Write a protein that binds this ligand. Structure first.
Ligand SMILES: [Mg+2]
Ligand SMILES: [Mg+2]
Ligand SMILES: [Mg+2]
Ligand SMILES: [Mg+2]
Ligand SMILES: [Mg+2]
Ligand SMILES: [Mg+2]
Ligand SMILES: [Mg+2]
Ligand SMILES: [Mg+2]
Ligand SMILES: [Mg+2]
Lengths: 127, 80, 113, 60, 155, 78
RNA sequence: AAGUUGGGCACUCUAAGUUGACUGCCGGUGACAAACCGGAGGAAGGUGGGGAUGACGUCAAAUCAUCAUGCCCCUUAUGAUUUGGGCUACACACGUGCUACAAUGGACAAUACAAAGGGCAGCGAAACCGCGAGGUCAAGCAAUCCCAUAAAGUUGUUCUCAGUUCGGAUUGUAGUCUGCAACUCGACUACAUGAAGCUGGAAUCGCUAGUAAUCGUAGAUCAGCAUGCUACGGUGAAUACGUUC
């Protein structure tokens, strides 16, 4: 029983559901394996499934929105952990032993005024 | 009818929204609870100095807040 | 290698082998490649010893001549050394068109720096 | 020589697009606005002391 | 940083090859932010190893880093009121990170006219000796190992 | 450069279209460096600059399609 | 087909109004000195990440051409109004910026995923006539409507290591648009033209995680015209043991 796993990574929301059965992930009425366009490491967002000691627990048929593509990805990886812990609340003390469930470390930041790339400075000539 | 409100200050428009839903709900009218439309800003980045000492500037904004209220029951006790 | 003087390159695609000739290249070479049994398939110096006859008979029909009208650019240009502008005093005193004649690295018409 | 220029500008020298836009309380001919008809330093002392609306400071 | 020990915290998993130390040299061939053209070229430069070498590239790969593996460093230090060099043996975390640059810097130097084949001639001919980049690690391997000097210096 | 009437200035047309009657030669006094060459032009000079020059330029049968009285330059180089 | 049409479903982001981080009970031992390295559970580290905020003061630094201005000069001209030249001129010297020297590259058709913005004579669809720059008409209009397809990348065809199918510098013809008009003095399109150039001497800069680099998106200024400019997302590494210079 798992529902409403939101997932956020770099301005790209993702809402999921989890249905019991076997591991079959799917977003936006089309596949995953030939949607994540470069991303040969599709299996490395399934990797919380690797470390929850069970791979084929549930099916997802998830949703996603916005962002880029790996910015649009990798939050599914975050988004199934919230609903995964809501499937059984034991896992907080046993999924945060590899430190995985939630961290939102970074987004892009402001171009600082009179600069060029928000930390870079223009080149000054000489002395 | 979907009357629209937009104002510069942000507490003024909420007290106006609860004023208009107060004068609507105290009469018989099945009004929706007031709707937050997203509030748009616009930016004015400008040079401080008077002569050519550029690359030292500061920015301004102004922020219009936009609410939304709709009634669906024209009653004589909710006319104006 | 018969089109204008010679068409030197062999074993390329013909669609760019017809760029080495003057007056035709890379976009009207697609257009003038208009003949049955004429398609670029890495047979530049092959596949044609009579099929080449149509694709230069049409070039002789292709009114702009390729190489025979090398006199008309200097007809037009030398006609513009009647001292009006735009060729007049970019050649009689020799500066360069480009609207900035000494502020930047204008060396495409200058000899050296 | 600019008080002649303001005497020109609110009149019309009859062609379509010969005019231009100048500052209201000041008189600069460059870097003026169209939301305010002020100009980039004459806007600033009128954006301060609260007297123009809209304007919080910065830093969004 | 005069303040000490900025943390490391870098992770590197992999899809098929099951090795942390193979996702490092995908992170150095990748220039200009295009990870979307690295493992398309890298894994098409390892599947062409067994067609060029005698074996799978896995059991050749630790040999290929093992022979290119640098030993000794010469970090110059003006000792006590003098100025000349000192040999330093590298701490084992730093030495692979120093090590992997010599694959890619000479990958862009072998004129084989195909980068997924020019670069892979230094994993072949790396488990076997006298490659392209082994010459530099033997050139600097004897930089101060034979030229042993004041070896009581601090830094 | 468009269609629709290559934009001779009209007062210049007013001068030429009735100036072409007799065998007299009093040319322009214009300093309007804008107009093109209508093909019905008689042997006459012009005065096409206004800072300081009245350069008498020949109306001779050049490429008359140029949208300029630009035979008179403005400055020197050396 | 997709209009998200109904259901009126309302939860799921969502869009502007609220609860709570602080060395807190923490283990040490600094001997009670605050604090320092550690462990716990808030998603959260020890000013969570950034901005806005610029102390007494220096440089007789900069501005009378934003304005204000003590004082001296101009007084049928050192004022005024047009038209028309100029601010772009040229053997040269130096700053900044861009686009490139190629095969993890180029061409070619097909082929997915953003943020922030503006638009009531402005933005302009759909279908239409053009090689394109565009031309006509033309409904919808401020989360809903329009500009507005993001692009890089993926799968696939092909050129196969060359002054080259690399690059467009230059140069004539034939147009479009804005305008009263594009010669001095704009911009864009396709037609050929196709130069310099093989990752650059002495030297010299910019950056410590969403950071430099990569292709893009929007805006003001503005009838028309930016490689600059301030804003926004996408892809995203390597490295910092150390204070000797
Ligand atoms: Mg929920
Ligand atoms: Mg005055
Ligand atoms: Mg310290
Ligand atoms: Mg904070
Ligand atoms: Mg802070
Ligand atoms: Mg403070
Ligand atoms: Mg004065
Ligand atoms: Mg100037
Ligand atoms: Mg469209």
């Amino acid at each position: 029983v798992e529902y409403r796993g939101t997932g956020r990574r770099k301005n790209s929301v993702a809402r999921v559901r989890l249905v019991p059965g076997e591991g079959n992930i799917t977003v936006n009425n089309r596949d995953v394996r030939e949607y994540l366009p470069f991303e040969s490491l599709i299996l490395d967002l399934n990797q919380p499934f690797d470390v929850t000691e069970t791979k084929g627990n549930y099916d997802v048929l998830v949703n996603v929105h916005g962002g880029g593509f790996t910015g649009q990805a990798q939050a599914i990886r975050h988004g199934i952990a919230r609903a995964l812990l809501e499937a059984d609340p034991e896992y907080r003390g046993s999924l945060k032993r590899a430190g995985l469930l939630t961290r939102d470390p970074r987004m892009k930041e402001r171009k600082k005024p009179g600069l060029k790339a928000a930390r870079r400075s223009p080149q000054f000539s000489k002395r | 009818i979907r009357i629209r409100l937009k104002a510069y200050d942000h507490r003024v428009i909420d007290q106006s929204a609860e004023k208009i839903v107060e004068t609507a709900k105290r009469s018989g009218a099945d009004v929706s609870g007031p709707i937050p439309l997203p509030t748009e800003k616009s930016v004015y980045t400008i040079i401080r100095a008077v002569h050519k000492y550029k690359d030292s500037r500061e920015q301004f904004e102004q922020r219009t807040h936009k609410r939304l209220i709709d009634i669906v029951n024209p009653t004589p006790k909710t006319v104006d | 290698a018969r089109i204008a003087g010679v068409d030197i390159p062999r074993e390329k695609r013909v669609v760019i082998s017809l760029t080495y000739i003057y007056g035709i290249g890379t976009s009207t070479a697609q257009k003038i490649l208009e003949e049955a049994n004429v398609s670029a398939d890495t047979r530049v110096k092959d596949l044609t010893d009579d099929e080449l006859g149509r694709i230069r008979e049409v070039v002789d029909g292709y009114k702009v001549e390729g190489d025979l009208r090398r006199e008309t650019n200097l007809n037009i240009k030398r006609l513009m050394e009647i001292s009006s502008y735009r060729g007049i005093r970019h050649r009689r005193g020799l500066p360069v068109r480009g609207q900035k004649t000494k502020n930047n690295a204008r060396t495409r018409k200058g000899p050296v720096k | 020589a600019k008080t002649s220029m303001v005497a020109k500008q609110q009149k019309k020298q009859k062609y379509a697009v010969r005019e231009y836009t100048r500052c209201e309380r000041c008189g600069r001919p460059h870097s003026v606005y169209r939301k305010f008809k002020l100009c980039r330093i004459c806007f600033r002392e009128l954006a301060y002391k609260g007297q123009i609306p809209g304007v919080r400071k910065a830093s969004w | 940083p005069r303040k000490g020990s900025v943390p490391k915290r870098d992770v590197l998993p992999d899809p098929i090859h099951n090795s942390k130390l193979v996702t490092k040299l995908i992170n150095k061939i990748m220039l200009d932010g295009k990870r979307g053209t690295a493992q398309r070229i890298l894994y098409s430069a390892f599947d062409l190893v067994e067609q060029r070498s005698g074996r799978d590239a896995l059991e050749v790969f630790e040999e290929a880093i093992n022979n290119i593996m640098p030993v000794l460093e010469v970090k110059a230090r003006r000792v006590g009121g003098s100025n000349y060099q000192v040999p330093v043996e590298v701490r084992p975390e730093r030495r692979t990170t120093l090590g992997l640059r010599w694959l890619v810097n000479y990958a862009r130097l072998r004129g084989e006219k195909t980068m997924e084949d020019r670069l892979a001639n230094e994993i072949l001919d790396a488990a076997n000796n006298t490659g392209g980049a082994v010459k530099k690690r033997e050139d600097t391997h004897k930089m101060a190992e034979a030229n042993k000097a004041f070896a009581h210096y601090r830094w | 450069s468009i269609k629709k009437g290559p934009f001779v200035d009209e007062h210049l047309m007013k001068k030429v279209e009735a100036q072409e009657g007799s065998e007299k030669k009093q040319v322009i006094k214009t300093w309007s460096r804008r107009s093109t060459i209508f093909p019905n032009f008689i042997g006459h000079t012009f005065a096409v600059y206004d800072g300081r020059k009245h350069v008498p330029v020949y109306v001779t049968e050049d490429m008359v399609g140029h949208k300029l009285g630009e035979f008179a330059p403005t400055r020197t180089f050396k």
